[PDB]
């Protein structure tokens, strides 16, 4: 038994059979992204310009899709066994997935009074901060469903759009919009004084980025046995960073409900996890675990960096492993997906049950490694500090090549409709 009635209740979108064109898909894709930078524009009700943190919100903050907090708990759960699965049937697949959307709209008002509640606005008329958590909770909720189109009428996903969306205009509009850096810089330096300032953040970013870069292109390559034939055949490559992709996204995202939950759970009561004073986190687990980025590293305070990287490390490794309990690189599909082609491993063992094996053992340390290097990468990117966030650049920059692929995976099936497999 389960919550299927209500579970029923909630609405989904129709997926035809029909011919959805790659030039479909693309058009559809387009449609979104749009009316999300729209949505960027466009100011929530409020008599008054008081409060203008586009700099949270705006770096991952607010635009956090309740879904990234919901996924959260659901993997925690699902994951740290408390509530074990074998997903395996299409009950499991459709109840933890199912579940886990109810729980993103539940999430979606809890985000949006916990905004308000950890004082987001300043002027708390119960009134006026009703209507506005309303609009609020509800905006997301056009993510949770655009989302659902994109993810059946388009390319690409939506929430990884949305990131890598935002990311990539918080930096064309930091670095050249209005009130720009590479401006506000190239003007210092017409007036005479130039400002290191101005111009540092955007080196900061070209920095993260060439890194984040070079080490999105390693993979972990595994030879391959002929297919009936005989000689050296197969070297399939994995995606070594992109692995623990949804994992490290999930890991920040923790982080990012401790600040909100602390400052919130602060301002709204006794100070169980931190004292903020100043907006942020000045002491407490939210302080020994406050992203250190913006403009310039902090060396002013080592133990504090220390601290964060190990912790973030520690979160990304479980996100990940819990990311192995569900979902993730599930070995019985990988058994006959290698048996069909019939290409064992280039060490060896052309036998089912016996790739299958090798395969069920090499996967734990990959995926630990994985992430345990992404969790320490991108928490170093955050260090050296760039525009849209460091982290939000990883992540983006992945987000951007898995939708290339995408896109060529596509360029291919409009060609020959059957291989939809291969």
């Not at 390319?155 to 990539?168: D, R």
């Not at 996204?249 to 709204?268: C, D, H, P, S, V």
């Not at 960096?305 to 599930?330: H, K, P, Q, R």
């Not at 460091?390 to 692929?405: H, K």
């Amino acid at each position: 038994k389960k919550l299927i009635p209500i579970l029923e209740k909630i609405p989904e979108v129709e997926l035809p059979v029909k011919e959805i064109t790659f030039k479909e898909k693309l058009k559809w894709t387009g449609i979104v992204l749009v009316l999300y930078f729209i949505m960027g524009c466009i100011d929530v009700y409020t008599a008054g310009a008081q409060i203008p943190a586009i700099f949270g919100g705006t770096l991952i903050t607010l635009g956090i899709g309740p879904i990234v907090t919901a996924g959260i708990i659901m993997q925690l759960l699902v994951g740290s066994g408390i509530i074990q699965m074998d997903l395996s049937i299409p009950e499991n697949r459709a109840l933890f997935q199912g579940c886990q959307k109810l729980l993103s709209i539940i999430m979606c008002f809890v985000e949006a009074v916990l905004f308000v509640g950890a004082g987001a606005f300043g002027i708390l008329t119960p009134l006026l901060a009703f209507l506005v958590i309303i609009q609020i909770a509800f905006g997301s909720i056009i993510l949770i469903y655009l989302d659902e189109i994109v993810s059946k009428y388009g390319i690409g996903s939506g929430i990884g759009l949305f990131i890598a969306a935002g990311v990539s205009q918080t930096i064309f509009v930091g670095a050249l919009g209005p009130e720009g850096y590479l401006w506000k810089f190239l003007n210092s330096l017409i007036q005479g004084v130039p400002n290191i300032e101005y111009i540092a953040p955007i080196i900061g970013t070209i920095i993260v980025f060439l890194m984040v870069v070079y080490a999105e292109c390693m993979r972990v390559e595994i030879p391959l046995a002929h297919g009936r034939i005989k000689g050296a055949v197969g070297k399939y490559p994995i995606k070594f960073v992109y692995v623990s992709n949804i994992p490290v996204i999930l890991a920040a995202a923790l982080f990012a409900n401790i600040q909100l939950w602390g400052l919130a759970l602060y301002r709204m009561g006794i100070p169980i996890l931190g004292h903020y004073e100043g907006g942020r986190a000045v002491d407490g687990i939210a302080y020994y675990l406050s992203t250190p980025y913006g403009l310039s590293s902090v060396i002013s305070d080592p133990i504090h960096a220390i601290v964060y990287m190990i912790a973030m490390i520690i979160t990304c490794v479980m996100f990940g492993i819990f990311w192995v309990e569900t979902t993730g690189l599930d070995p019985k599909s990988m058994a006959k997906r290698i048996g069909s082609l019939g290409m064992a491993i280039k060490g060896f063992r052309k036998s089912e049950k016996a790739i299958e094996h090798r395969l069920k053992r090499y996967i734990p340390p990959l995926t630990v490694m994985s992430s345990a290097f992404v969790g320490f990468l991108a928490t170093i990117a955050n260090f050296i500090g760039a525009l849209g966030g460091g982290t939000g650049v990883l992540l983006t920059v992945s987000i951007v090549y898995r939708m290339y692929e995408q896109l060529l995976r596509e360029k291919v099936s409009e060609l020959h409709p059957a291989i939809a497999k291969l």
